[PDB]
Structure formats: structure tokens, C-alpha cells
């Protein structure tokens, strides 16, 4: 899944 700070 996407990193904690992505998007």
C-alpha cells in the first residue's frame, strides 16, 4: 500500500 505520507 501507499506510504504514510503519500498522496
Amino acid at each position, epitope marked *: 500500500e501507499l506510504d*504514510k505520507w*503519500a498522496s
Partner: antibody
Amino acid sequence: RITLKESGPPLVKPTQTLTLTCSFSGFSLSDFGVGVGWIRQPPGKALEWLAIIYSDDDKRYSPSLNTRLTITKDTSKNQVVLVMTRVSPVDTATYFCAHRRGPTTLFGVPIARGPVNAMDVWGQGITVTISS
Amino acid sequence: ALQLTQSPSSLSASVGDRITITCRASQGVTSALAWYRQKPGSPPQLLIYDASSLESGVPSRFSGSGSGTEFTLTISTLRPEDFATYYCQQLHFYPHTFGGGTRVDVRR
């Protein structure tokens, strides 16, 4: 100045449980967005990401070692613990813990996430050998 | 998981030379990429973060560029302490995978 140091058993036998501790200073696990991760390196091989925990207690694990790993933090003692169950000879390696910056804030407001894209400070690492 | 391939896997060089190491991702990782230098017997050391930002305290010799699936680390004027192993790390997706590394040794 930020510093981290890994501690634990230099030798552990197969099937046993390995508990590694990361003691740090210079930052708190109550600081916004900060993380502490664990990376291993078998002798002569490449770095392998294991897990990470953040100040808000969010935790993430390597999908390959997920069932054998548990990461926890003790905010008050400035420590993070990684427990690896059922170790085997292949888990022999140098284990490093490292700090991850949280987003930069201005008067409390996050204004930059660029600093989170790296593990900026690493411990010296602790060598663990798994053999009966 | 996301695959990071460094190239070359090994590189020979001489003090004073300019070298470039590449890291390619199997999927785009935006700018969430870091470069580290690991001297023998020591832990990795952060050189570049967020693909191109120079980490405080790191000599200006090091610079990083690229985004998406293509990244490069370049050392202008290689120094003796630069003979080591370099790794790239991706932090856009979990797990935060590392490249296989690129060994830089003395050419002869």
C-alpha cells in the same frame, strides 16, 4: 544531535525468539510524524527493510516477515522493540534501527513532506547470529 | 513488492573521477527516494533524500536527480572515502524497499 543504538543477543538458536531494542536520544516518539524503523543486512548482502513504527502508533511490517514480527515503542524510555519469532539460520545478519523525519511544520502546520523521504540517522547496528 | 534495480552492480573508479549510479523502479515512486553510502564496517549514511535534496552535513560532491522510475546519484570528483557501497531506497510504497547496491572500488 540524534543517536540510536541497538541492543540484544549476539547469538540466538533456531526456533527461538529474538528481541531487539533500539534506544535513542535527540527526539521523542511523541514528536509529530516521526518514525523508527528496522533494517537488516545479512553478511555480504543488501539491505532489507523489516518494519517501522510512528509516534501515533501506526505500524507497518515487511509482508515477507509479517507473521514473525512485532514492533512496539516505549515512548517514556525512548525505545523501540522488535520481536522476531521462530528464527532460523537465514536470519543471521546485522540489524539496524533508524530514524525517519516527520513532515516539517511551521507554527504547528505541516508545510513540507520532502524530509520524510529517507531514514536520516542510523544506529551502529547489532550483529546477530542464529545457530544451535 | 516494488522492485529497485541499481546499475551498475559494481563500478571501478579513481580518485578525482565523476561517477553516476542509477536506480530504476518497477513502478513510479514519485520523488520518495533516498541514496545512502555504506563504508565497510559501518552503517549506511544518508546522502540524498526526496530524490534530490542534499542532506545536511553531506559534501556538495553528491547530487541526486530523477523522479518516477528513473533516479541517478552522481559524485563529482570521487574521494578516497567514497570507495564504498551505495544503495537507493524507495519510500512511496510499503514495504520501503532497497536496491541491490552498487559497489565502487579502486580501478586498476
